[PDB]
Design a protein around this nucleic acid. Structure first.
Ligand code: MG
Ligand code: MG
Lengths: 740, 482, 740
RNA sequence: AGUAGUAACAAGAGCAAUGUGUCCGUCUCUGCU
RNA sequence: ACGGACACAU
């Protein structure tokens, strides 16, 4: 007998065993090396789905821009970018008609949020393209470099601290004829390695001031840096993702905030809901769609995806959408919300790392960067890259390629959702007055479309009408990744509905394990992950007990904290054995101290110190929860506050080093900022709890607080008059220095 | 835009649009769809990091030697139980390699094991060991500023993988991995006391699950992979410049409860300066076996198999003297592969959550706990296999071991081909299910779906086995509608 | 005293780079430069912890450990080492140092853990003193809904609690805002007196107060009770096929018990009327019902709950009735008149279609409690006259908003401005009458100028209230006056005596019909505490989703018994008390018309041989649990009230409610498998059918040798020997003959 | 050679987006019975 | 509030 697992699908329905179709115990596919090929692939495909549009040269950046909007209507079922502006406006008008007062309420919430948003909201991001360095940096670092370069050049509106004054400075900086930025250069030096006796190159990074031109600054300000998405499941081949710089991100924030306010109040939007709330919404859509039907009606559901969603969207269509949503609003608000589609209509894509080239005679390899690929002779590429380089050369500018159509992956998810919801909203039966009507739900590109009709040919006419309206607005339904069946089963973003949502436990399998913060935090995470999957993902009680045991096994290996009566030997077996032998109540020792596992199903929601507290020895409890705990940070009130956390809440050491790279000159500023922010929190205690607001400088705030604190202390008799005079004279000396 | 009013613009553009822009529904019938087209070429070869069904253990029962629990001490204690050594000869060559280098690697390793002191054996960097560990094979990385003069700078090649044909060995490996052994491989840690009645029910079900799941051969592969990837990660981070010897150890308890330490062979680590997560550390694997590689020669393409000894083998009747082979190859692993290999025990979750869910589904219908009916009443009521007599039905414990073996083999043979194939063939599985529910399924491009599936079946033997499994399931579904 | 920080600020200002940063960075820009990081980012902490614990020193701690922990263990381990620098305030630490501190460090007499983490000790006290009942196995119908995972303070919302926390912990940092409640003030003074002389860090105090005071919610799939003490043990109490009966340790909450008494009252009242003695069943169920493992009639003798269905359960036993109901928390006591409820489809002020429930019929009111009084003359959608009283002048103004929400005329329903979604973000139906309540509390100018004026005569004892806040003596609003003394007490707050009859209509010693069973609000809320109707008249867990599955689950396993009762003496089968709680899902006017159709369908299955569909006898059988009518009308679906939404049930074919599955050989009800009926498929699957149409026989599929097509309602004028083609429902046609 | 797979590693600079949801926290060594 | 982890879509 040959063993076939898939024959279990003969007896069990496929949705009830859908977890055996996810191979989520192995590693996901990662990308090796460059992401330049996927960037060039997406630029080629975006210009391939729009090729019958108009070509123009930009007057400001000098780039070749392709305009497929109001282009020739498609004549086949290929992906097209020829969206019709009148049909988009008609769909947004129908969305406004079916929802009266929706656009005005969402615009009013966005107007109230624009005036009260700080610049530091832009520090919420991850790795941001830093145009001052031509490199990715963290979001707070990239914003600090942008604000530094702006205030060095005379753009001091962002000194007010509001995000909209920073956006006014971003728009005013494009008039600057010569930007002066600080760049990271390096100094190489050939030294000898002392532990392998090999001549290596010592890299030493310093700062350097250069002068950008107006066109170079404008190209960098419209530049989206690209890379490959790693650890992606379900795909054979990799795709590229993009990160915008700091001049785009505030406008994208305001546009997506408006579109989030619209999407919250739409019953056909799958965003921003998620988890149990999204499943409740999809079940409500199914039941309401069977409620808004008579009994002489077929009902079919499309489980739908869209082909190349982000490449066939268009920023000019987004401009028309934003202007129609904000109709009858203040013109500063309509001009502020239009900036992000205008900037995405004129964007360039930085190509990436370049390519690694190899020399067989010299036995070397070198990374040729993306800005040097236009000067390499074409015989030096391989065949696919030769074809990619030759059909992208008219788009290439300054190491970037011009990309006017397409939005990018994930740049406008809610606005694209509103467009899909407008096509879903077209299919109401009082609007259409056909023999068919539709309804459904739409996430970023995924849709579940329920078509009702009296005959199967009416279902076909409704599918054709939906498909061709979607083609009119640039949306291309995937014919190979979509299918249709009767209502009762579908799929929506790996949620599987078979008369109700089934559980897909395999999707949660990468979260079962030791998290790697410290001993106490990992214990809390492990028990909580088991409990959350018991509640939501249908982890059965026997499998949850097995999960507790597997977590405790991996935890006891990872922190080398096996039980005090074990026969194993580690680096810390002897001290744990001493602690085990000297202890009367062994059942109160933590698992990180060789104690027994206290956890079963009923107490998974109780932390391990609370669970064992009535079983600890008072000596062990006094040492473990000692308020003089030397492993945690102590806040100075010298005199410091007491600690609450146990000794197992230590921090693990870091390694931010780069091989053969000395970078003390670029790591000085972070230390100086940390010292300044530490001395601020001696004057303002709640700075680490709530972010402090203010337009005055840190030094003025500190001196004002010191003066009023000394005066209130002299009024309350908690200091003397000599101490008051000495504090006030120290403040006057600091002001004498601050004047200079 | 501010003064736009709709005047039927969508219907005008729909009248103007060609009729070749349509979504025509092709009715789906699994009785008329085709099988997946598996590729051709040479046969698929073995690519696991260790031997699965051909591996041999040298064992010590109740190890009580000095420094017990230290890996090289246990490896010496296990090598002491084999005295049938002889002069190693290459009996099957690695056709792309230098096989005398593999011979010299084995003699150097055995000589250094014979006279090692300490806890960690680091081999001397000789030329055969530097060859087999790929030292010096990278071109010297240079900056392009000092490289413009170089007139033969050619771009790295990006060739697709070559197609392989499905061979019969990977089905034999999956049949062997669903079988019960004579030992417990998983030692589950202790639990708190059961106070709730649901905890009594869960402990009673968990005892059945442990009795089926811990003696499986796939559990031995779990513990083998966990030990190997753990020791390789610790060696790769603490001994980045050494040519470390890592024994392949497991530890089991037999049916009498006695401890047993098993040795499967050795791994010689190369240099491990792993900066990216996909940076490969090279190692040499040398694994004991009783399997002659000259029967299924195509399985052993990357190996240089030696004959290193002879062993008295006691069969069911009497005693023979079989040869003992040593399978030697170069292999390589990254830090993310070691990370996901150290966590193969979550395969035990993916199996058991499925089986318990089936147990729970019937328990919602029969209104009682159906655990002891499912495990004690030895009914054959789940299709798990295809014999020449047809579809074979197994018990729920066999289903436990088969789904466990499937998760383990997903973890061992994890590839992008597997990810793509699973995500794409899930749609065809759901379409077949929608037909069997009388929900009238229909497609828009079924030919494009088949081309999306079949481009993910290239050379991975597990993916070819899963595609063949889908073809067998499709034939079974078409026969059930006959 | 504050001298050290000003000396340190002087020392930092004497450095030039630090002075430039402290003078140029504002307090808003400090949020950006606090998160400045210039090194490489550390990724993958799980893998990093896996290999870092193989090292000797993975822990970085402060240098004070050099004075607190020795350099050498008793076993000879090295516990800490100095770093590669010289004057670093940081050492590299082995985990053996943590074990040394836990076994031999300084024992402390003062531990802070039970006070800071008092919430988790409350959880463990609730679990340890809790009680476990048995485990029952059945199909759990969970519903995803928003519940509390932290109950918070009852007096506070989340934002008010955060402002209380800022006033308690950091009082000189609160900025411009004050505390806008007296509850905030009392909680703030209490917490400030509690937290005096605390040596805990203020941030830990703030997080402890957030664990105590801030209410957190999540969307979770709940099957049973929804109070916050049953949600913490949700992983223990429910699974996919089982329910563990658990009572938490401690005394229950009062507002939780007040709510679940009402829900349990309405179930017992609605179950009783479809019995043959609605009183003897209500007494049989009230004495066995338990709430949170406490009997019902001991709760019904001490609770001040004033509700309509609670009053039937008390007047049946003998407890005296405090006759009033509650909107907004006020006692809305009736005086005279009588009404009846029947919902309708009306339109609202924000242009949304709403299904309201309006009380049609005259009802005289004496609405009064704890701040004011009102005598509301009111009929059908008409606030006629309300002489409203008060104690202070301002408390009448807020209660003026209270009565004008309860009025529900054609004026207040179209004087709504803003955005009032009666659904939530998961398309979950919020009840409408409380949504106008919370909206008109602060938006009241549309309810004062649209209401207009009505002329009055100058009688003494009467004041007035204008739209613009003017007290007047010439004109006032429509139907609202102002009195001085009002109505005194101890007539609303007296529990009067009453008597009940066989059909639960509650009349007093005079004969005022104070409660009729037709006036019971037919809503299905979810309870905070569990309810055990331990009776043979109910099912295990109540709920409209559970009554549907449990009834069909019972017919399927008893099918060998019920099929024989169906075959001979069938009226004994229809009169089953197992079929009786299913009738609470059918609307009242639809009950006798459905049984008259169903039994007429069942009789044609008997007089025509071979037309035995056991899958359709099962589906139609609990719709015959009522004395029939003789109304010869055609139905294609039967509607069923579940959570307000009428689910249809098709006479021919599957639905979302009753789906037969040929693949699994099972009947699926609402996504729950309820078992294989008989597995008699070969005797089944016939050609002629008889239980779909009334007086008609379906004869196979569609054929046009007889003429045109008809529909289900247009078959009234037919004759003998005449066949036709009829749209039967669900997109198909069958040949249909009206028989002899 | 080998890992691998559309481009790399095989030492000599380590390139992690957007949106949504859920969960947790608050600064010279290698031994899983 | 901030950070980390995981999932999904782009
Ligand atoms: Mg897509
Ligand atoms: Mg998609």
């Amino acid at each position: 007998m040959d063993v076939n697992p898939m024959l279990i699908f003969l007896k069990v329905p496929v949705q009830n065993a859908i977890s055996t179709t996810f191979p989520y115990t192995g590693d996901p596919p990662y990308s090796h090396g460059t992401g330049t090929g996927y960037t060039m692939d997406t630029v080629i495909r975006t210009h391939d789905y729009s090729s019958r549009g108009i070509w123009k040269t930009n007057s400001e950046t000098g780039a070749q821009q392709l305009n497929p909007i109001d282009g020739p209507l498609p004549e086949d079922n290929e992906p097209s970018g020829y969206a019709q502006t009148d049909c988009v406006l008609e769909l947004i008008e129908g969305l406004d008609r079916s929802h009266p007062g929706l656009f005005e309420t969402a615009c009013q919430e966005t107007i109230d949020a624009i005036q009260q948003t700080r610049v530091d909201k832009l520090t919420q991001g991850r790795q941001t393209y830093d145009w001052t360095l031509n490199r990715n940096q963290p979001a707070a670092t990239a914003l600090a470099n942008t604000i530094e370069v702006f205030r060095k050049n005379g753009y001091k509106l962002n000194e007010s601290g509001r995000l909209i004054d920073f956006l006014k400075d971003v728009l005013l900086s494009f008039e600057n004829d010569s930007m002066e930025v600080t760049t990271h250069f390096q100094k190489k030096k050939r030294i000898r390695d002392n532990h392998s006796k090999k001549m290596i190159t010592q890299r030493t990074i310093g700062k350097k001031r250069v002068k950008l031109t107006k066109k170079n600054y404008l190209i960098r300000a419209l530049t989206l840096n690209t890379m490959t998405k790693d650890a992606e499941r379900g795909k054979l081949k990799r795709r590229a993702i993009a990160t915008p710089g700091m001049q785009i991100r505030g406008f994208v924030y305001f546009v997506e905030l408006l579109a989030r306010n619209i999407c919250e109040r739409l019953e056909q939007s799958g965003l921003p809901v998620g988890g149990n709330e999204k499943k409740a919404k999809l079940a409500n859509v199914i039941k309401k769609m069977m409620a808004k039907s008579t009994d002489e009606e077929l009902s079919y559901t499309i489980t739908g995806d869209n082909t190349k969603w982000n490449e066939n969207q268009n920023p000019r269509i987004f401009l028309a959408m934003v202007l129609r949503i904000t109709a009858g609003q203040p013109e500063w608000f309509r001009d502020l919300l239009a900036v992000a589609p205008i900037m995405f209509s004129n964007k360039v894509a930085r190509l990436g790392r370049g390519y690694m080239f190899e020399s067989k005679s010299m036995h070397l390899r070198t990374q040729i960067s993306a800005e040097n690929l236009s000067d390499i002779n074409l015989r030096y590429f391989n065949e696919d890259t030769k074809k990619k380089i030759e059909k992208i050369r008219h788009l290439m500018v300054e190491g970037t390629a011009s990309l006017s159509p397409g939005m990018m992956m994930g740049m406008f998810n809610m606005l694209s959702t509103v467009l899909g919801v407008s096509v879903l909203n077209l299919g109401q039966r009082e609007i259409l007055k056909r023999t068919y009507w539709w309804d459904g739900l739409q996430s970023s590109d995924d849709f579940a479309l329920i078509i009702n009709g009296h005959f199967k040919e009416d279902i076909q006419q409704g599918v054709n009408h939906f498909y061709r309206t979607c083609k009119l607005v640039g949306i291309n339904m995937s014919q190979k990744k979509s299918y249709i069946n009767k209502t009762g089963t579908f799929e929506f973003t790996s949620f599987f509905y078979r008369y109700g949502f089934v559980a897909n436990f395999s999707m949660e399998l990468p979260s079962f394990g030791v998290a790697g913060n410290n001993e106490s935090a990992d214990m809390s995470i492990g028990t909580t992950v088991i409990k959350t999957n018991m509640i939501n993902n249908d982890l059965g009680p026997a499998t949850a007990q097995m999960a507790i045991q597997l977590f405790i096994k991996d935890y006891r290996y990872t922190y080398r904290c096996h039980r005090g009566d074990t026969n194993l030997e580690t680096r810390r077996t002897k001290s744990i054995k001493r602690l085990w032998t000297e202890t009367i109540s062994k059942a109160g020792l933590l698992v990180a101290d060789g104690g027994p596992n206290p956890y079963n199903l009923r107490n998974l929601h109780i932390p391990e110190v609370c669970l064992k507290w009535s079983l600890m020895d008072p000596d062990y409890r006094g040492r473990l929860c000692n308020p003089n705990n030397p492993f945690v940070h102590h806040m100075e009130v010298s005199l410091e506050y007491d600690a609450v956390a146990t000794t197992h809440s230590w921090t693990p050491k870091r390694n931010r080093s780069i091989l053969n790279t000395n970078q003390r000159g670029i790591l000085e500023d972070e230390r100086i900022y940390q010292k300044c922010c530490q001395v601020f929190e001696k004057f303002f205690p709640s700075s680490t709890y709530r972010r402090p607001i203010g337009m005055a400088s840190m030094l003025d705030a500190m001196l004002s607080r010191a003066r009023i604190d000394a005066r209130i202390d002299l009024e309350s008799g908690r200091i003397s008059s000599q101490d008051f005079s000495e504090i006030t004279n120290t403040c006057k000396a600091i002001e004498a220095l601050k004047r200079q | 835009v501010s003064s736009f009013k709709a005047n039927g613009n969508i219907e005008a553009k729909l009248g103007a649009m060609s009729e070749k822009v349509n979504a025509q529904i092709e009715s789906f019938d699994p009785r008329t769809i085709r099988e997946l087209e598996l590729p051709e070429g040479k046969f698929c070869t073995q690519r696991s990091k260790f031997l699965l069904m051909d591996a041999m253990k040298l064992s010590v029962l109740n190890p009580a030697h000095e420094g017990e629990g230290i890996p090289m001490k246990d490896a010496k204690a296990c090598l002491d139980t084999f005295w049938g050594w002889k002069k190693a000869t290459i009996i099957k060559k690695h056709e792309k390699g230098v096989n005398t280098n593999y011979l010299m690697i084995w003699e150097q390793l055995l000589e250094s094991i014979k006279e090692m002191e300490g806890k960690f054996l680091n081999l001397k960097k000789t030329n055969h060991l530097k060859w087999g560990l790929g030292e010096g094979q990278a071109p010297e990385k240079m900056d392009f500023e000092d490289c413009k003069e170089v007139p033969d700078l050619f771009q790295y090649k990006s060739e697709p993988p070559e197609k392989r044909k499905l061979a019969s060995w990977i089905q034999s490996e999956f049949n062997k991995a669903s079988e019960l052994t004579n030992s417990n491989w998983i030692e589950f840690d202790e639990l708190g006391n059961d106070v709730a009645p649901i905890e009594h029910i869960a402990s009673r079900r968990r005892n059945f699950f442990t009795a089926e799941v811990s003696q499986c051969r796939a559990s031995e592969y779990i513990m083998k992979a966990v030990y190997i990837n753990t020791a390789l990660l610790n060696s790769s981070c603490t001994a980045m410049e050494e040519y470390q010897v890592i024994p392949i150890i497991t530890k089991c308890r037999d049916t009498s409860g006695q401890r047993r330490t098993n040795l499967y062979g050795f791994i010689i680590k190369g240099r491990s300066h792993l900066r990216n997560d996909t940076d490969v550390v090279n190692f040499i694997s040398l694994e004991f076996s009783l399997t002659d590689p000259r029967n299924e020669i195509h399985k052993w393409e990357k190996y240089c198999v030696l004959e290193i000894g002879d062993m008295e083998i006691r069969t069911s009747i009497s005693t023979i003297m079989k040869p003992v082979y040593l399978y030697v190859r170069t292999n390589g692993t990254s830090k993310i592969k070691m990370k996901w290999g150290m966590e193969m025990r979550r395969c035990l979750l993916q199996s058991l959550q499925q089986v318990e869910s089936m147990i729970e589904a019937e328990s919602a219908v029969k209104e009682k706990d159906m655990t002891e009916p499912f495990f004690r009443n030895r009914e054959n009521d789940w299709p798990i296999g295809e014999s020449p007599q047809g579809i074979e039905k197994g018990t729920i414990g066999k289903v436990c071991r088969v789904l466990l073996a499937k998760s383990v083999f997903n973890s061992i043979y994890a590839s992008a081909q597997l990810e793509g194939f699973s995500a794409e063939s899930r749609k065809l599985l759901l379409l077949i299910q929608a037909f069997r529910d009388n929900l009238d399924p229909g497609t828009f491009d079924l030919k494009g779906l088949y081309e999306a599936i079949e481009e993910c079946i290239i050379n991975d033997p597990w993916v070819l086995l899963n595609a063949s499994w889908f073809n067998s399931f499709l034939k079974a579904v078409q026969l059930s509608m006959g | 005293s504050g001298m050290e920080r000003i000396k340190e600020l002087m020392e930092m200002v004497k450095n030039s780079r630090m002075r430039e940063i402290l003078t140029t960075t504002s307090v808003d820009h400090m949020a950006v430069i606090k998160k400045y990081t210039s090194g490489r980012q550390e990724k993958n902490p799980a893998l990093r912890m896996k290999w870092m614990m193989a090292m000797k020193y993975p822990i970085s701690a402060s240098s004070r450990i050099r004075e607190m922990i020795p350099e050498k263990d008793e076993d000879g381990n090295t516990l800490w080492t100095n770093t590669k620098d010289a004057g670093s305030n940081r050492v590299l630490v082995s985990p053996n140092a943590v074990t040394w501190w836990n076994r031999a460090g300084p024992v402390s007499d003062v531990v802070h853990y039970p006070r800071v983490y008092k919430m988790y000790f409350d959880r463990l006290e609730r679990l340890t003193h809790g009680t476990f009942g048995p485990v029952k196995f059945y199909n759990q119908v969970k519903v995803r809904k928003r519940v509390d995972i932290n109950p918070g303070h009852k007096d506070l919302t989340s934002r008010e609690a955060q402002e209380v926390i800022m006033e308690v912990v950091f009082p000189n940092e609160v900025g411009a805002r004050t505390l806008s409640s007296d509850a905030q003030l009392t909680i703030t003074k209490e917490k400030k007196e509690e937290l005096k002389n605390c040596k805990i860090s203020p941030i830990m105090v703030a997080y402890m107060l957030e664990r105590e005071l801030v209410r957190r919610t999540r969307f979770l799939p709940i099957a049973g009770a929804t109070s916050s003490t049953y949600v913490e043990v949700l992983h223990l109490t429910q699974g996919t096929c089982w329910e563990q009966q658990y009572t938490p340790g401690g005394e229950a909450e009062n507002d939780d018990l007040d709510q679940t008494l009402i829900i349990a009252s309405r179930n017992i009242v609605r179950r009783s009327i479809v019995a043959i003695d609605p009183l003897a069943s209500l007494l049989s169920m009230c004495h066995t019902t338990s709430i949170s493992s406490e009997p019902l009639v001991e709760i019904l003798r001490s609770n001040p709950t004033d509700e309509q269905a609670v009053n039937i359960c008390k007047a049946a036993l003998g407890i005296r009735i405090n006759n009033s109901f509650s909107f907004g928390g006020y006692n809305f006591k009736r005086v005279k008149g009588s009404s009846q409820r029947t919902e309708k489809a009306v339109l609202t002020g924000n242009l949304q279609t709403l299904t309201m429930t309006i009380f049609e019929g005259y009802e005289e009111f004496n609405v009064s409690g704890k701040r004011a009084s009102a005598v509301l003359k009111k009929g059908a959608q008409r606030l006629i006259q309300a002489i409203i009283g008060g104690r202070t002048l301002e408390d009448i103004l807020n209660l003026m908003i209270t009565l004008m929400v309860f009025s529900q005329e054609e004026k207040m329903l179209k004087a709504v401005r803003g955005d009032l979604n009666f659904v939530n973000r998961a398309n979950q139906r919020l009840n409408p009458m409380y949504q106008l309540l919370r909206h008109f509390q602060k938006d009241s100018s549309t309810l004062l100028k649209n209401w207009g004026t009505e002329e009055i005569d100058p009688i003494m004892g009467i004041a007035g209230i204008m739209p613009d806040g003017t007290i007047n003596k010439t004109q006032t609003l429509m139907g609202v006056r102002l009195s001085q003394g009002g109505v005194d007490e101890y007539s609303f707050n007296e529990r009067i005596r009453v008597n009940i009859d066989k059909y639960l209509r509650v009349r007093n010693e005079k004969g005022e019909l104070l409660i009729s069973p037709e006036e019971v609000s037919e809503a299905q809320g979810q309870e905070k505490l569990p309810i055990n109707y331990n009776s043979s008249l109910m099912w295990e867990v109540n709920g409209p989703e559970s009554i549907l599955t449990n009834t069909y689950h019972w017919i399927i396993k008893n099918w060998e018994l019920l099929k024989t009762q169906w075959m001979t003496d069938p009226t004994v089968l229809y009169n089953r008390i197992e079929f009786e709680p299913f009738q609470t899902l059918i609307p009242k006017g639809n009950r006798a018309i459905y049984s008259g159709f169903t039994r007429t369908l069942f009789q044609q299955m008997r007089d025509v041989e071979g037309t035995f569909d056991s899958i359709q006898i099962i589906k139609l059988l609990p719709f015959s649990a009522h004395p029939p009518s003789l109304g010869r009308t055609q139905f294609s679906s039967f509607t069923l009230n579940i959570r307000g939404a009428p689910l249809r049930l098709l006479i021919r074919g599957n639905s979302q409610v009753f789906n037969y599955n040929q693949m699994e050989n099972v009947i699926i009800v609402l996504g729950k498998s309820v078992g294989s009926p008989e597995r008699s498929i070969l005797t089944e699957s016939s050609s002629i059918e008889s239980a779909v149409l009334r007086g008609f026989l379906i004869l196979g599929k569609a054929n046009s040798k007889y003429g045109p097509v008809l529909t289900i309602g247009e078959l009234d004028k037919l004759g003998r020997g005449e066949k036709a083609n009829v749209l039967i429902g669900q997109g198909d046609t069958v040949l249909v003959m009206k028989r002899k």
